[PDB]
Design a protein around this ligand. Structure first.
Ligand code: MG
Ligand code: MG
Ligand code: MG
Ligand code: MG
Ligand code: MG
Ligand code: MG
Lengths: 139, 19, 139, 19
């Protein structure tokens, strides 16, 4: 099962997206792909900060009415159980000279709690969190 | 079905964005 | 209803806590006090990073077996609805020259979603989030 | 009942901490 990090779901939306990432996303079974509520918040914030009004309005519509519905029932919250895993992962990394930022920590804890592999371009923090990861920029 | 293609299509109609 | 920020619930645990804050906490009706899962994660992380092993073990026990049970059923998750409020609040602050960090944004969005007043020492970010706030260091 | 007092008691038995 996969938990898509913000940098992966955002790649296809770029002017010249990496074809390898797009193809990988196309090989996945939708029902097996999840999003953390944290990633949804970051996606929504990114859209709301666009400098081009026209683009923002259109992308807001597409995000809410076309993209997020693909994940209905699979937007995972950061709740009490995930909070426990978060503290465990971040403290362990810290007491072992590893680096994990809060944001990455939230995603990593969500994935561990649900037994998911994190898809992300930046695998560093997740390796330290001892959570499975996959970088779609690679084969 | 094809998640990547679905998203790439959105990016193209708006001209692309950096999220 | 109140959402306690990390700096408030942590104050009584200090060597010489501010008596005004402790008294304020004592005037509250427990059932009307909530914690964000984000704050629980930060409390748990803080305890796990203590340099004194003995202290860490004892405080871990007290947090899990004595403190958190006081909030059973009232540890609020950061879920999809809260994510929407988060993006709204942070983007609005940004487009209006106001400052709100991610961490404070999560707490503020949780409070707005549940119609709660945030209790915190640092009211700055919450004022910009247009969420009710109360600083127990004041009367 | 008294949340602040409950917490202050914990802080005192452990010697106080900075969270
Ligand atoms: Mg995610
Ligand atoms: Mg938005
Ligand atoms: Mg989550
Ligand atoms: Mg809280
Ligand atoms: Mg802990
Ligand atoms: Mg929350």
């Amino acid at each position: 099962m996969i938990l898509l990090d913000t940098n992966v779901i955002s790649e296809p939306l770029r002017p010249q997206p990496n074809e390898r990432v797009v193809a990988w996303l196309d090989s996945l079974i939708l029902e097996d792909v999840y999003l953390s509520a944290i990633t949804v918040a970051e996606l929504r914030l990114g859209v709301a900060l666009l400098l081009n009004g026209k683009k923002k309005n259109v992308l807001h519509e597409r995000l809410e009415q076309s993209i997020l519905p693909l994940f209905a029932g699979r937007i995972l919250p950061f709740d009490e159980p995930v909070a426990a895993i978060y503290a465990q992962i971040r403290s362990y990394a810290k007491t072992h000279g590893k680096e994990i930022a809060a944001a990455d920590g939230y995603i990593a804890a969500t994935a561990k709690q649900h037994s998911l592999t994190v898809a992300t371009r930046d695998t560093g923090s997740f390796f330290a969190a001892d959570v499975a990861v996959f970088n779609p920029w690679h084969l | 079905v094809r998640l990547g293609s679905m998203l790439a299509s959105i990016g193209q109609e708006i001209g692309g964005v950096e999220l």
